[PDB]
Amino acid sequence: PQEVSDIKKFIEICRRKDASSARIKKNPKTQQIKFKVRCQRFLYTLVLKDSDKAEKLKQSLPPNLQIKDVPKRNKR
Amino acid sequence: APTRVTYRRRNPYNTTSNRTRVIKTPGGQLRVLHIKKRGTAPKCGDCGIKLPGIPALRPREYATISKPKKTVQRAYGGSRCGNCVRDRIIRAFLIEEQKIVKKVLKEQSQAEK
Amino acid sequence: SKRTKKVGISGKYGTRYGASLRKLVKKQEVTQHARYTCTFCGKNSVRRTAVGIWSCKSCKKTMAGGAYTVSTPAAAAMRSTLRRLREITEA
Amino acid sequence: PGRGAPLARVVFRSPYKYKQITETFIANEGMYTGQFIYAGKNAALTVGNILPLSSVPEGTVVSNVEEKPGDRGALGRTSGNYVTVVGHNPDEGKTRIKLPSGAKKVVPSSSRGMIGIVAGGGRTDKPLLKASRAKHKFAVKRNRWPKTRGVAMNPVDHPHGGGNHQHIGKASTISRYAAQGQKAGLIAARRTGLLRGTQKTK
Amino acid sequence: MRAKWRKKRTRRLKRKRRKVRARS
Amino acid sequence: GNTFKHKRALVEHIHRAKAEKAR
RNA sequence: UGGGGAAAGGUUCCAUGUGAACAGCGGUUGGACAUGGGUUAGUCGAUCCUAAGCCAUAGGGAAGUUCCGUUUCAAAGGGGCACUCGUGCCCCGUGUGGCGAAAGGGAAGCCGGUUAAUAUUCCGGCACCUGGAUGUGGGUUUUGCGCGGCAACGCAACUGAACGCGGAGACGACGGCGGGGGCCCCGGGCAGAGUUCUCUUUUCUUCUUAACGGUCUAUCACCCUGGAAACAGUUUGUCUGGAGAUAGGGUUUAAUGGCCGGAAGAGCCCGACACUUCUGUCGGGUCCGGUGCGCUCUCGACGUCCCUUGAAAAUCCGCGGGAGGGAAUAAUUCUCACGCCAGGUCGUACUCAUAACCGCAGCAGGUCCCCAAGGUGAACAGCCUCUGGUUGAUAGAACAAUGUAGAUAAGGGAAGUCGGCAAAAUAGAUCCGUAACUUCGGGAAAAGGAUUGGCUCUAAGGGUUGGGCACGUUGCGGCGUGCGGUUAACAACCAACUUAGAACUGGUACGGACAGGGGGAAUCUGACUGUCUAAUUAAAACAUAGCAUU
RNA sequence: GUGAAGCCAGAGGAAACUCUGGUGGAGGCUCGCAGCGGUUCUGACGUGCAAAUCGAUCGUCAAAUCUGAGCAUGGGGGCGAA
Ligand SMILES: [K+]
Ligand SMILES: [K+]
Ligand SMILES: [K+]
Ligand SMILES: [K+]
Ligand SMILES: [K+]
Ligand SMILES: [K+]
Ligand SMILES: [K+]
Ligand SMILES: [K+]
Ligand SMILES: [K+]
Ligand SMILES: [K+]
Ligand SMILES: [K+]
Ligand SMILES: [K+]
Ligand SMILES: [K+]
Ligand SMILES: [K+]
Ligand SMILES: [K+]
Ligand SMILES: [K+]
Ligand SMILES: [K+]
Ligand SMILES: [K+]
Ligand SMILES: [K+]
Ligand SMILES: [K+]
Ligand SMILES: [K+]
Ligand SMILES: [K+]
Ligand SMILES: [K+]
Ligand SMILES: [K+]
Ligand SMILES: [K+]
Ligand SMILES: [K+]
Ligand SMILES: [K+]
Ligand SMILES: [K+]
Ligand SMILES: [K+]
Ligand SMILES: [K+]
Ligand SMILES: [K+]
Ligand SMILES: [K+]
Ligand SMILES: [K+]
Ligand SMILES: [K+]
Ligand SMILES: [K+]
Ligand SMILES: [K+]
Ligand SMILES: [K+]
Ligand SMILES: [K+]
Ligand SMILES: [K+]
Ligand SMILES: [K+]
Ligand SMILES: [K+]
Ligand SMILES: [K+]
Ligand SMILES: [K+]
Ligand SMILES: [K+]
Ligand SMILES: [K+]
Ligand SMILES: [Mg+2]
Ligand SMILES: [Mg+2]
Ligand SMILES: [Mg+2]
Ligand SMILES: [Mg+2]
Ligand SMILES: [Mg+2]
Ligand SMILES: [Mg+2]
Ligand SMILES: [Mg+2]
Ligand SMILES: [Mg+2]
Ligand SMILES: [Mg+2]
Ligand SMILES: [Mg+2]
Ligand SMILES: [Mg+2]
Ligand SMILES: [Mg+2]
Ligand SMILES: [Mg+2]
Ligand SMILES: [Mg+2]
Ligand SMILES: [Mg+2]
Ligand SMILES: [Mg+2]
Ligand SMILES: [Mg+2]
Ligand SMILES: [Mg+2]
Ligand SMILES: [Mg+2]
Ligand SMILES: [Mg+2]
Ligand SMILES: [Mg+2]
Ligand SMILES: [Mg+2]
Ligand SMILES: [Mg+2]
Ligand SMILES: [Mg+2]
Ligand SMILES: [Mg+2]
Ligand SMILES: [Mg+2]
Ligand SMILES: [Mg+2]
Ligand SMILES: [Mg+2]
Ligand SMILES: [Mg+2]
Ligand SMILES: [Mg+2]
Ligand SMILES: [Mg+2]
Ligand SMILES: [Mg+2]
Ligand SMILES: [Mg+2]
Ligand SMILES: [Mg+2]
Ligand SMILES: [Mg+2]
Ligand SMILES: [Mg+2]
Ligand SMILES: [Mg+2]
Ligand SMILES: [Mg+2]
Ligand SMILES: [Mg+2]
Ligand SMILES: [Mg+2]
Ligand SMILES: [Mg+2]
Ligand SMILES: [Mg+2]
Ligand SMILES: [Zn+2]
Ligand SMILES: [Zn+2]
């Protein structure tokens, strides 16, 4: 797994043919939002502190991608 | 907490290839991890000291890392240390110069007749 | 603080092998464990590596010598005789 | 291991091919790493050089002397030993030499030798002093240590055999032309006993 | 580098040259 | 050498040394 | 007497059932008897390489089965290019077989879950290696194959044939010292449990973080400036320096170190409701410090020893050289990023031993390794305890002689006996004291004496942080400085142990169990340490260094 | 447990040299646990647990110490610190 620094590169990663899916994980105790995209070789993570760009970023993603919300206590 | 461990492979003997170290797992257990042997630094071809700027790996591992990481930008980049390269340049120049003066002196001062 | 009267380096042998034999081995142990001044660099760092090999810790040169001394009297005499034989006849 | 007399590794250059060749000589006292040495008929009279005996004056000392020109060295190759040139004979091409045992020999003048004495000094001067020290010496040579006395075996084992006392029972000097299994003792002995005077033979 | 490594690179060049000919 | 027994002995020796050096 | 393996065995493994026989008593139980089921790999091994060694080929012996010989007295090979289409061309040449290691060398996988019985092999997530094809992005080149730094060298790339040089693979035993991971130990906090006549802010348990990556650092060593005697730097252990030290500034080999991705969504601990079953559902928590001649593994710099100097091959890389090839609109055999495809064959259950191996057997014998908690204590000694594991060896009743094993005796103290055989006596630690002889190293723990509990105190042995003015900048500034000075060494905080002294106290006892040398004066004989008659003899016998002879 | 070379400091003497306190950690040295071995009881047992075992008492214990796998030597032959 690898980390992505800025937002512009993370958007360009999600516009790739081998991008299978994406998900959103939020940690309320430490007030973080994590965006993860599943590619052929690696899983890319982007970490955000605020919450006024998360929905802005969410609508900027390509519409054909599948985005989930990572429920607590995922079933086996 | 003071739990005992076992090997994870069929070899039960403490040889120079049965290297292990202890870890603790996200499941809260003490286990064993099997590790390779340490790399060795390449040496200078004249005096035999460790070359600076070059990693220490097992021999097969050098086939995958990029070229600029395996050499330094100078004549005799690998395998010579730089002090030795300085000696070679000076010695080559001085000996070549004495060759000319010995030739001229021998030809002129002794074959003038 | 002298801590030994006469046995010296051969005090590791206790009360074994006989007095005369301990003296004879003492003569050879003292000279093979000493330091000698290098002929090429000048420093006082030359020790025995193997039975006939002597090496300098500073300038990294090794030389062929005697069993327990850096040079032998027979070799020293021969070098002068060879020097005289070649020189005073050809020069 | 197994030898006194350290060895020297010397690198030469090929006259007919683009490469280099590494040799292994016996080391004379006084040689050092980084030293130039010379070999041939026109080499100089310096320690460590190799030249034919026809190019040396009488009284010089050499080591690793060929018995015949080309066999690469047979005589005087042990620590602290050498051979001495005695005389020449240019019309027929022979040289007289003296060997470490004290014997005299005649050799063709094209044989080669190395100027100097064999390094290794007076190794045999200090006592071994311990059984373990002798054991370490032979453990890298051959299986010959320890050694049981024949007079302490049974008659089936050795000629010195048994008896109600340890003794030999017959003369211990054995003829030169005996059978294998009989030669145990002093073979073809010209004399016996403590050597009092000088030894006439040279 | 090893000879098998170098053989692969020149093999690719030969294929590319015949294919670019086939293209032309 | 076996001169100073502990830290206090070394400090006292320093003070006397500087006192005589003063003169 | 726990948890796993190598050799050896071969179904002994799991479930259901059972008359006899077997388990030297019984048996509803079984490693027994009957019927069914169970072993999943590109990453762990074999397969590849060579060692000691074994065997083909050229040749020579032998009536012959066959013996020798392993590079030799041999015409002994391999590399490239088109093919109209295999047929044809052109280079180099000293050399030229195989088998042999499940502990040597060696490309690549970790965590969680799952079964009656398999798992680093199955399921989920997240990676890596080799081989083969190949396209985008980026890089280089308008005068052809990259820039930067005084330098050590750095950067995502950044042509390189024949022939040659070098490095890695690749190596001994022992000693003290330093860094890192795991275990042990101490203090605080949140949950749960045990005790509670009395005491105890108490006693016990959980509080975890993998492979693979990114980023900042970490001994040795190397570079630049400069020029040392009033010599300096410096290790527990005396090495280093005009062949260039101290000092100031830099470069670099080496994470099992800090932070981030993986990753809390996992695992673990509590609580509240559902639920015949099928089924579950929902809330909280999962922190912060210290200590050490501690135990175990690993790394580093030093040192000692040798008439002892402690493997080879496969495989991978760099360099010297400059053959061939290439753009001005495209070219690029760019070791850079991402992307496409594949990885065959055999083993894998279980035991490894007072019942799965070998001893005629379910025999007190024998058989190679890894992991290693608390207390006392010098301690892997003996003795008691936790996790884990057993409660299995025919039983019931009685207490005669004679036994085997364990012990105590008044007074005398070897009078017993071939002979002090057996037993008894001594024993830790601290402080005194110690002869003849001697190869001067020893004898020596020679011999002979004194002390030792409990409680209340006193003294000594360490670490970190602070130091006064005068200018200028900076959200009490932190510093660029010009200085002055050596607090007659002060203040605050932090932390284990080791040693020495005093008073008081008791049925004079205190290494209170365990653990734990009897000593002296002489004779014979072998110098010493070592070795042998497996199953009646361990010795004065053998070996040994030294000496002499051939 | 004992404490060899090398090293630091102080003291004595005209010199050559001598004395004292530390540091260091050598030896086919020494007490002793595991392993390896087998002195005595002439102990147990002696139709034995056992065709060589059991108990107590003993020897050595950092080097001529103990040990696995692979390989070699074959019967008038091997191997033998005998
Ligand atoms: K580098
Ligand atoms: K010969
Ligand atoms: K032998
Ligand atoms: K003998
Ligand atoms: K006798
Ligand atoms: K005799
Ligand atoms: K495989
Ligand atoms: K695959
Ligand atoms: K196989
Ligand atoms: K294979
Ligand atoms: K071989
Ligand atoms: K034949
Ligand atoms: K192998
Ligand atoms: K299965
Ligand atoms: K491009
Ligand atoms: K570039
Ligand atoms: K090896
Ligand atoms: K350590
Ligand atoms: K540690
Ligand atoms: K630790
Ligand atoms: K502890
Ligand atoms: K790994
Ligand atoms: K100086
Ligand atoms: K020390
Ligand atoms: K160990
Ligand atoms: K070129
Ligand atoms: K298995
Ligand atoms: K298994
Ligand atoms: K096994
Ligand atoms: K303990
Ligand atoms: K204990
Ligand atoms: K009774
Ligand atoms: K009775
Ligand atoms: K008596
Ligand atoms: K009697
Ligand atoms: K006592
Ligand atoms: K007498
Ligand atoms: K003995
Ligand atoms: K015996
Ligand atoms: K004995
Ligand atoms: K014997
Ligand atoms: K004698
Ligand atoms: K010691
Ligand atoms: K023992
Ligand atoms: K026979
Ligand atoms: Mg006999
Ligand atoms: Mg006979
Ligand atoms: Mg006879
Ligand atoms: Mg006889
Ligand atoms: Mg069963
Ligand atoms: Mg059953
Ligand atoms: Mg029965
Ligand atoms: Mg029955
Ligand atoms: Mg039954
Ligand atoms: Mg059955
Ligand atoms: Mg493997
Ligand atoms: Mg054959
Ligand atoms: Mg034939
Ligand atoms: Mg093979
Ligand atoms: Mg292996
Ligand atoms: Mg690939
Ligand atoms: Mg090149
Ligand atoms: Mg982490
Ligand atoms: Mg890191
Ligand atoms: Mg410095
Ligand atoms: Mg994290
Ligand atoms: Mg949780
Ligand atoms: Mg199992
Ligand atoms: Mg077992
Ligand atoms: Mg048994
Ligand atoms: Mg059996
Ligand atoms: Mg204690
Ligand atoms: Mg009974
Ligand atoms: Mg009795
Ligand atoms: Mg009595
Ligand atoms: Mg009495
Ligand atoms: Mg009495
Ligand atoms: Mg007795
Ligand atoms: Mg006493
Ligand atoms: Mg005595
Ligand atoms: Mg004896
Ligand atoms: Mg016997
Ligand atoms: Mg006996
Ligand atoms: Mg001993
Ligand atoms: Mg002993
Ligand atoms: Mg008996
Ligand atoms: Mg009986
Ligand atoms: Zn160099
Ligand atoms: Zn030197």
Q: What is the DSSP code string of D96-162? A: EEE-TTS-EEEEETT-EEEES-BS--SGGGS---SHHHHHHHHTTT-S--S---GGGS-TTT-TT--
A61 and A67 in contact (C-beta within 8 Å)?
Answer: yes
Question: Strand G closer than 7 Å to the CB of B47?
Answer: no
> For the CA atoms of B77, B78, B82, B86, what is the dihedral angle to 10 degrees?
-60
Cα–Cα distance, D48 to D38 (Å, whole number):
8
> Cβ–Cβ of D31/C64 closer than 8 Å?
yes
Mutate to test the interface with C, among D7, D55, D83, D129 (most CBs of C within 10 A): D129
The amino acid sitting at C76 is A
Cα–Cα distance, D146 to D133 (Å, whole number):
12
Experimental method: cryo-EM
F15 and F9 in contact (C-beta within 8 Å)?
Answer: no
Which of D160, D136, D132, D134 has the alpha carbon at shortest distance from D148? D160
The amino acid sitting at D65 is V
Strands D50-52 and D112-115: antiparallel
> Cβ–Cβ of D119/C62 closer than 8 Å?
no
Residues 50-69 of C with CB under 7 A from strand G: 50-51, 57-59, 67
Strands A21-27 and A67-68: parallel
D95 and D54 in contact (C-beta within 8 Å)?
Answer: yes
> Cβ–Cβ of D126/C25 closer than 8 Å?
yes
Residue listed under structure tokens 């294929």: E15
Cα–Cα distance, B48 to B59 (Å, whole number):
18
Q: What is the DSSP letter of E14?
A: H
For ligand 25, the distance from its centroid to the CA atom of residue B14, given in whole angstroms, is 9
Question: Residue C61, exposed/middle/buried by CB under 10 A (0-12, 13-18, 19+)?
Answer: middle
CA of A19 to C1' of H50 (A): 77
The token pair at B31 is 């286990």
Cα–Cα distance, C50 to B6 (Å, whole number):
45
The b-or-e profile of B20-50 (16+ CB within 10 A means b, else e) is eeeeeeeeeeeeeeeeeeeeeebebeeeeee
Which of D104, D103, D76 has the alpha carbon at shortest distance from D95? D104
Which of A24, A60, A64, A18 has the alpha carbon at shortest distance from A42? A18
What Cα–Cα distance (Å) separates residue D43 from each residue in C70, D27, D69?
27, 18, 17
Cα–Cα distance, D121 to D82 (Å, whole number):
12
> Cβ–Cβ of D122/C67 closer than 8 Å?
yes
Which of D120, D11, D29, D108 has the alpha carbon at shortest distance from D65? D108
Cα–Cα distance, D149 to D157 (Å, whole number):
11
Residue listed under structure tokens 């050795």: D158
What Cα–Cα distance (Å) separates residue D78 from each residue in C59, C68, D4, D128, D172?
30, 16, 7, 19, 32
C28 interaction partners in chain D (CB closer than 8 Å): 125-126
Question: Strand G closer than 7 Å to the CB of B88?
Answer: no
Query: H helices of A1-76, where?
Result: 7-14, 54-60
Cα–Cα distance, C67 to D137 (Å, whole number):
15
CA of F3 to C1' of G468 (A): 37
Instruction: Name the nt closest to D127 by C-alpha to C1'.
Output: G545
**Alpha carbon A2 to chain centroid distance?**
12
Q: What is the DSSP letter of B62?
A: G
Question: Strand G closer than 7 Å to the CB of D149?
Answer: yes
D167 vs chain C: nearest CA distance in angstroms?
Answer: 29
Cα–Cα distance, F15 to F4 (Å, whole number):
14
D119 interaction partners in chain C (CB closer than 8 Å): 52, 64-66
Resolution (A): 2.4
CA of D115 to C1' of G481 (A): 73
Phi, psi of E8 (to 5 degrees): -65, -40
DSSP string, B70-100: G--SSTTTTT--SHHHHHHHHHHHHHHHHHH
List the binding residues of C for Zn(2+): 38, 41, 56, 59
Cα–Cα distance, D4 to D1 (Å, whole number):
8
D150 and D159 in contact (C-beta within 8 Å)?
Answer: yes
Question: Strand G closer than 7 Å to the CB of B7?
Answer: yes
The token pair at D101 is 């045992």
Cα angle: B51, vertex B52, B58; to 5 degrees? 65
Q: Which helix (H) or strand (E) holds C21?
A: helix C19-32
Cα–Cα distance, B104 to B111 (Å, whole number):
10
